[PDB]
Amino acid sequence: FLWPAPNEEQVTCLKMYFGHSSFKPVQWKVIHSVLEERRDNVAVMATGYGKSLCFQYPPVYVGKIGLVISPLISLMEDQVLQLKMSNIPACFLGSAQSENVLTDIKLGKYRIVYVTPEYCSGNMGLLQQLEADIGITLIAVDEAHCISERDSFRKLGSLKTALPMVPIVALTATASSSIREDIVRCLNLRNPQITCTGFDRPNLYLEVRRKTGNILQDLQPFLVKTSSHWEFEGPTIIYCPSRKMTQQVTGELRKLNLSCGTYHAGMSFSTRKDIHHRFVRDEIQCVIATIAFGMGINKADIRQVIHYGAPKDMESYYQEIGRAGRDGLQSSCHVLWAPADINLNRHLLTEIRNEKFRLYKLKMMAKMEKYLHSSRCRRQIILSHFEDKQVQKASLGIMGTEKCCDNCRSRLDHGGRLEVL
Ligand SMILES: Nc1ncnc2c1ncn2[C@@H]1O[C@H](COP(=O)(O)OP(=O)(O)OP(=O)(O)O)[C@@H](O)[C@H]1O
Ligand SMILES: [Mg+2]
Ligand SMILES: [Zn+2]
Ligand SMILES: [Zn+2]
């Protein structure tokens, strides 16, 4: 019912190591449950809120081990670097690691340890020694970037068996009751605290447009012209359905001599740290990406997001656009789509085998098409999917305004009802 305010020493720790002056509410609710109440958590946090602080902060505060489990190996490398820049010792642990590195974890060097779901199953005795010798503040089972996953996730029911005293934070991307029930049974969570941040990003304007037949003609509205050169109005990410289309979009932007970078799924640590530096320093105006996570696209002042093609589904779409406007200033997210787009092609779906995943692909395909075809508020459609209920239109202060979405804006441009309270 009531959450106590963080004490002085807790706020000071958050300032020294994470560079924040105060907690956001759901962050504190999750942190306080884990740190002070030792309670299992299922935390529904939309992207951009600060998921990663909820499991990084407690172990740093008490100087103990925090165990983070995630299937995305490159993302965990990116976080370990970010933590090292913040003076926080962290490592990514696997069988490929030296026996020497395992020594430092036993001795307690690393506040935050990253492992894959597979590694965690085969080294349970190692964890209990870490519990006995050093002490574990929490176990973070992310699975909020889960795509096409398995046995790996059902082998984690042993954590509460081997480590009954260690709280578990389960981060998730939807408020779905079905997902929450599955997570609770899989992890054997005990009366878990449930939180939800909500999913709105009021500073993102949502537009959908049809393609015109040529890449340059589609991108022309998004370019401004200095008397010498063409440029985007601001830092821009362009999401493509494939690396072939990324190279096509890249080729057209060279014709205008635009600072561009590509961001794909097999890039090395150096390549990802190079894109990050160039993107944040504005040395490249635009990133054309085939993935929706990692260092390279982690920038605070991305002004424009363009989907050059229909997105695969709402979950990917929400994550992709959530990289924009992280500074809280105005941003725009445009989809450029055609009915023949790859992520809207049903006929390709026949060739792949698995049934009821083709049906899931079918349902996501049809849901995505309904969104792109909608004449109603696009913000309402997205929030209703992630809240798993019917979000009432114009309850939030942004919906129904010229800043909300192209359908609201055009309706207000044609004698719409600017709603007074
Ligand atoms: N309490 C806070 N006060 C101010 N800024 C914060 C706070 N917590 C987090 N942030 C900042 O908000 C931004 C979003 O946080 P973060 O980078 O952890 O995203 P995320 O939700 O974990 O994303 P993803 O889904 O990609 O993992 C970052 O710039 C982070 O430093
Ligand atoms: Mg994160
Ligand atoms: Zn309490
Ligand atoms: Zn709207």
Side-chain angles (χ1 to χ4, degrees):
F1 298 100
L2 285 173
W3 282 263
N7 58 41
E8 178 196 347
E9 345 155 45
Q10 287 172 344
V11 169
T12 299
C13 186
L14 174 64
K15 290 167 175 296
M16 300 298 175
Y17 282 112
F18 299 91
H20 302 133
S21 294
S22 61
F23 300 89
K24 300 180 190 175
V26 182
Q27 284 185 343
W28 174 246
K29 284 156 140 163
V30 175
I31 289 172
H32 181 69
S33 282
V34 171
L35 234 188
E36 316 211 38
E37 312 211 359
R38 314 306 299 165
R39 186 175 173 183
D40 289 336
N41 266 72
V42 188
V44 189
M45 323 193 62
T47 185
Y49 194 97
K51 246 179 309 158
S52 306
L53 178 68
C54 298
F55 61 83
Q56 292 169 353
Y57 178 89
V60 172
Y61 175 65
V62 307
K64 284 194 181 185
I65 288 187
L67 179 72
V68 190
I69 309 172
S70 173
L72 295 187
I73 291 198
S74 97
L75 183 55
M76 303 182 294
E77 296 173 354
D78 299 1
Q79 285 188 25
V80 169
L81 182 68
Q82 291 165 8
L83 291 160
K84 289 179 184 177
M85 308 300 256
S86 288
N87 316 89
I88 300 173
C91 80
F92 162 61
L93 181 59
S95 60
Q97 234 68 28
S98 78
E99 188 187 15
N100 169 86
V101 176
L102 191 49
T103 312
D104 303 71
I105 313 176
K106 290 167 177 168
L107 299 172
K109 170 158 73 170
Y110 297 105
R111 304 284 121 262
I112 299 161
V113 181
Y114 287 87
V115 293
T116 59
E118 310 80 53
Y119 177 89
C120 195
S121 64
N123 306 108
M124 270 299 224
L126 170 61
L127 271 58
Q128 289 164 293
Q129 171 176 347
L130 292 177
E131 166 70 4
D133 286 19
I134 298 304
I136 305 176
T137 313
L138 56 83
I139 293 177
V141 187
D142 192 313
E143 65 184 0
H145 309 68
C146 198
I147 301 183
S148 68
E149 287 263 323
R150 200 193 162 178
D151 294 23
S152 55
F153 272 135
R154 299 187 175 183
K155 290 193 190 87
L156 299 192
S158 43
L159 282 174
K160 259 308 186 307
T161 288
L163 309 159
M165 292 256 298
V166 182
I168 293 185
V169 196
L171 308 172
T172 181
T174 172
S176 172
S177 165
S178 313
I179 297 297
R180 190 178 70 244
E181 294 289 327
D182 275 356
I183 296 175
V184 163
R185 296 218 328 288
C186 280
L187 305 179
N188 291 269
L189 300 190
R190 284 83 199 266
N191 200 98
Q193 220 246 106
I194 315 302
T195 60
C196 173
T197 66
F199 301 87
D200 191 42
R201 299 292 295 277
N203 55 317
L204 309 191
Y205 166 78
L206 308 179
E207 181 158 318
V208 177
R209 181 187 305 163
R210 285 279 289 267
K211 295 174 162 183
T212 58
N214 148 260
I215 298 178
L216 286 181
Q217 184 181 334
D218 290 327
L219 294 178
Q220 181 168 325
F222 302 84
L223 296 174
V224 295
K225 185 185 167 172
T226 306
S227 305
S228 53
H229 53 273
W230 287 97
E231 276 176 357
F232 284 109
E233 313 194 24
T236 308
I237 299 186
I238 299 197
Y239 292 113
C240 290
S242 70
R243 187 175 324 197
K244 169 171 184 176
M245 181 64 63
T246 288
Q247 259 170 327
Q248 300 183 247
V249 176
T250 275
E252 300 317 291
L253 295 185
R254 301 155 166 174
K255 294 176 181 182
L256 308 161
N257 205 37
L258 257 72
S259 295
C260 313
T262 66
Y263 198 47
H264 298 300
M267 294 186 161
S268 58
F269 190 54
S270 311
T271 299
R272 297 198 314 276
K273 89 172 180 60
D274 291 358
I275 296 285
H276 180 75
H277 162 282
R278 248 186 277 254
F279 203 19
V280 305
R281 309 290 185 95
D282 292 339
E283 296 161 11
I284 56 172
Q285 264 247 290
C286 172
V287 174
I288 315 181
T290 49
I291 68 181
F293 60 87
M295 272 190 281
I297 57 183
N298 179 64
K299 184 166 157 55
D301 60 330
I302 284 153
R303 292 279 64 92
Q304 178 78 43
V305 163
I306 294 176
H307 278 86
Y308 197 77
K312 310 167 204 175
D313 43 62
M314 291 294 310
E315 275 97 6
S316 310
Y317 178 58
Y318 185 70
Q319 166 158 87
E320 265 123 58
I321 72 178
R323 305 294 170 195
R326 292 210 167 191
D327 54 5
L329 316 172
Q330 189 69 59
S331 286
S332 288
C333 309
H334 287 64
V335 176
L336 311 182
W337 78 284
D341 279 357
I342 313 174
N343 292 328
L344 295 179
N345 184 279
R346 329 274 176 156
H347 286 291
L348 218 172
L349 280 181
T350 77
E351 296 181 344
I352 54 98
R353 287 180 178 176
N354 183 278
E355 226 67 27
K356 230 300 177 186
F357 190 81
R358 199 197 316 178
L359 176 64
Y360 196 77
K361 282 287 285 193
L362 238 62
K363 177 181 173 67
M364 293 299 101
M365 205 152 288
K367 273 190 178 177
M368 182 53 51
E369 178 144 6
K370 258 170 66 74
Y371 175 80
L372 302 169
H373 259 88
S374 189
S375 57
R376 317 234 72 189
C377 181
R378 306 214 195 264
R379 184 172 251 86
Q380 184 183 9
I381 289 166
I382 302 176
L383 302 180
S384 295
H385 165 83
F386 288 85
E387 228 72 36
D388 198 26
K389 38 174 180 169
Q390 270 295 334
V391 175
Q392 285 99 328
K393 193 185 181 307
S395 84
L396 268 44
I398 176 66
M399 275 182 298
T401 59
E402 191 173 359
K403 310 279 186 179
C404 168
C405 70
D406 62 343
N407 289 342
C408 292
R409 169 186 297 178
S410 271
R411 183 153 50 255
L412 300 183
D413 258 63
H414 303 142
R417 295 186 179 272
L418 293 169
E419 189 144 50
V420 196
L421 296 177

